[PDB]
């Protein structure tokens, strides 16, 4: 690629999450952006069905 000047600096992403934890159904959507080669990213996740979540969000962190 020659140099970093020719790489995409950032890339956006979108997410839909649907599931059931301990019988509780929920659905989420999310939107984010990251830097593919620097390995950093951030996203915002919104619960659209089954909120407020009756369990810790943390169990979903590696899935979103």
């Amino acid at each position: 690629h020659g140099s970093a000047s020719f790489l995409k600096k950032t890339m956006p992403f979108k997410t839909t999450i649907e599931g059931t934890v301990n019988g509780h159904y929920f659905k989420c959507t999310g939107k984010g952006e990251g830097n593919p080669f620097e390995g950093t990213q951030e996203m915002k996740i919104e619960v659209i069905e089954g909120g407020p979540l009756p369990f810790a969000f943390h169990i979903l962190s590696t899935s979103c």
Partner: protein
């Protein structure tokens, strides 16, 4: 969200090589107090935008535990071992929730990553480590709205080098 990894030391990038088609992943996480969290994910590229579709089934979380009590604290950083099996990649890691007041609750992740390209079109990485720093930076609401950051690095064990030229 494995497209966002900084790979060092020349380690091939299985995820970025998988585009434009993309890849899937599948995982069961087993918590030390009996919970299981299983997920399947599809990653696709729609023009310039990545698109994730995630299915989740979790069960057997104890009613008196940090998860169902929503008293989880924050994740410690973690390190995954990643290596080839059956012409795809396997990952495993130990993660740990630092709960309020100091106790850690641990879990074990068991993952398979599957390129949508045939293995013959890919340069497979050797055994290596993937560090993940996951921080839930803003609890905007509840319950309902969260902001999450991640930094990830693919690397070898540089701090304790081989005396034989091994990675």
């Amino acid at each position: 969200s494995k497209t966002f990894i900084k790979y060092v030391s020349g380690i091939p990038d299985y995820f970025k090589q998988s585009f434009p088609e993309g890849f899937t992943w599948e995982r069961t996480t087993t918590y030390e107090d009996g919970g299981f969290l299983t997920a399947h994910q599809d990653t696709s590229l729609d023009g310039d935008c990545l698109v994730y579709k995630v299915k989740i089934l979790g069960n057997n979380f104890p009613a008196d535990g940090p998860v169902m009590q929503n008293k989880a604290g924050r994740w410690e950083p973690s390190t995954e071992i990643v290596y080839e099996v059956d012409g795809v990649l396997r990952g495993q890691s130990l993660m740990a929730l630092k709960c309020p007041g100091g106790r850690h609750l641990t879990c074990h992740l068991h993952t398979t990553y599957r390129s949508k390209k045939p293995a013959s079109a890919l340069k497979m990485p050797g055994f290596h480590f993937e560090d993940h720093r996951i921080e839930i930076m803003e609890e905007v609401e509840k319950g309902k709205c969260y902001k999450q950051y991640e930094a990830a690095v693919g690397r070898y064990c540089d701090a304790a080098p081989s005396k034989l030229g091994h990675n």
